[PDB]
Design a protein around this ligand. Structure first.
Ligand SMILES: CC[C@@H](O)C/C=C(\C)C(=O)O
Lengths: 290, 281
């Protein structure tokens, strides 16, 4: 009795204006969580909360396309060794949308200590596919580079990505743009029940690292996902191969903000997901972790 | 994964002041519900909602004894054949208490019904032969079940807890044993059918229009102290019709062990005559 691999139960009541989704986050319930290690701690990235909201959406809307807007990640979620954190999605009805807060707390002790991990707005969307163009893009992005450079760039910042977070198999650089080929890790097997697997969303955010491999600065810091203007999920892909096109640059005013648009699409070019106004900010992941 | 035979799930959140308990009422999930048949409809009596609140208490308080105050039964709960009603207990914190609403609604589709309201808080803990002397009129338990049978309130086998009855002056002492159909009474605080039987005790004082009987309407305070592992318990009941209007019956009840340990007590029980036809819609 699992509503969604990411959601254990849903609760609503005529005597409550909010709708609740409840989930138990731990390495045993979600094995791939053991593959995102920051300074030796299990950490749930924001991308994961995006996948979680797509799940909730799939349990509340009748349609498949939806959009998450004005996303912020106030506080990172870390899971102590062999620990389990209760995570809730709280949806407040607005005009033809829901304001959402993704929060968590330690169930094993009412409640008083809790944390907010994501906030924003959530509503249905329409199809916009697509399309795309995949061959026009392979022409602008022709400097092949090794995917290891991305993972190594993260490894040096103490962001140790396991197998299930390493979707990017190939990388082509252009002028301020990058095209990644992605394959489903061999350690992931249930992508059919997910709208977008947390690790796939994260890989999409990882693509931006390929535009900042050169930069000088503090080797302790990297660009961490900080805000998103709009994330649109169109439909889930049975495909083991996807393409991810990203473009963006550092803010002219502040060399600590990296702004980008991202497009995840099909082998045939059907747009799977789209990100407008992705902003990452330079940070030491240690300080995010508390 | 069932928290309590009457409660499937519990929910609370730092972003919700209320505590919620959720339960799925249907004949398959709760077999004994098939033993309370009103004019071809399955009906959940108030006593049942009381047992549900005792369950919630056992899942929320640290203490074991608790009390329900200013109880009302705004609307009876009816379950269509092969139907399933979602039933929720909603607890709002007050000053050292909870205001509660017991509600239900049909999951297979804003439309909902309130079946009980009141207040809920902790309580404290507090002679059989002296009683067996004042109550010496042996009478057949069938008289109560027959008296009810005539009002079209048909209690099945699992609702027949009263094995023996001794009547006194405005008082009754009932011997009760667990029907052969019940085997799981250990996980309940107070099994719904036993709570209902206690309310059934008052009928032995009203064996006197045969279409109507006293329907539970309000309770001043219901106190649950502790459950008895005993398959045999004692039921002490006293009360009378309101002196001013012969339509209200007010009574206190004492359920206790063969050893004399008080298991549960009801103060200010008030029932009102009503036609069960009108309850069902
Ligand atoms: C490129 C880093 C991206 O995958 C997300 C990192 C997060 C959320 C963190 O370090 O807390």
């Amino acid at each position: 009795t699992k509503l969604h691999p990411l959601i254990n139960q849903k609760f609503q009541s005529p005597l409550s204006k909010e709708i609740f989704f409840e989930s138990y986050f731990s390495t045993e319930n979600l094995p791939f969580l053991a593959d995102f290690i920051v300074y030796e701690q299990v950490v749930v990235p924001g991308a994961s909360h995006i996948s979680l909201l797509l799940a909730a959406a799939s349990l509340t809307f009748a349609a498949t396309e939806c959009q998450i807007e004005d996303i912020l990640f106030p506080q990172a979620l870390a899971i102590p060794e062999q620990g389990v954190r209760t995570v809730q999605v709280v949806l407040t009805p607005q005009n033809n949308s829901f304001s959402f807060q993704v929060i968590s707390f330690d169930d094993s002790l009412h409640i008083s200590d809790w944390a907010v991990h994501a906030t924003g707005k959530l509503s249905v969307a329409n199809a916009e596919q697509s399309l795309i163009p995949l061959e026009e893009i392979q022409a602008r992005c022709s400097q092949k580079i090794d995917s290891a450079e991305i993972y190594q760039h993260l490894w040096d910042r103490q962001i140790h990505l396991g197998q299930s977070f390493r979707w990017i198999e190939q990388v082509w650089l252009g002028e301020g743009e990058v095209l990644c080929q992605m394959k489903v890790p061999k350690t992931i097997l249930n992508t059919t029940k997910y709208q977008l697997h947390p690790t796939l969303v994260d890989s999409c955010f990882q693509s931006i690292i390929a535009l900042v491999l050169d930069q000088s600065g503090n080797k302790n810091e990297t660009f961490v996902p900080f805000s998103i203007d709009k994330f649109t999920f169109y439909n889930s892909s049975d495909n083991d191969l996807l393409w991810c096109y990203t473009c963006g640059s550092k803010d002219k005013q502040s060399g600590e903000k990296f702004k980008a648009d991202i497009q995840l699409f099909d082998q045939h070019g059907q747009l799977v997901a789209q990100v407008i106004g992705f902003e990452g900010r330079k940070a030491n992941p240690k300080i995010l972790l508390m």
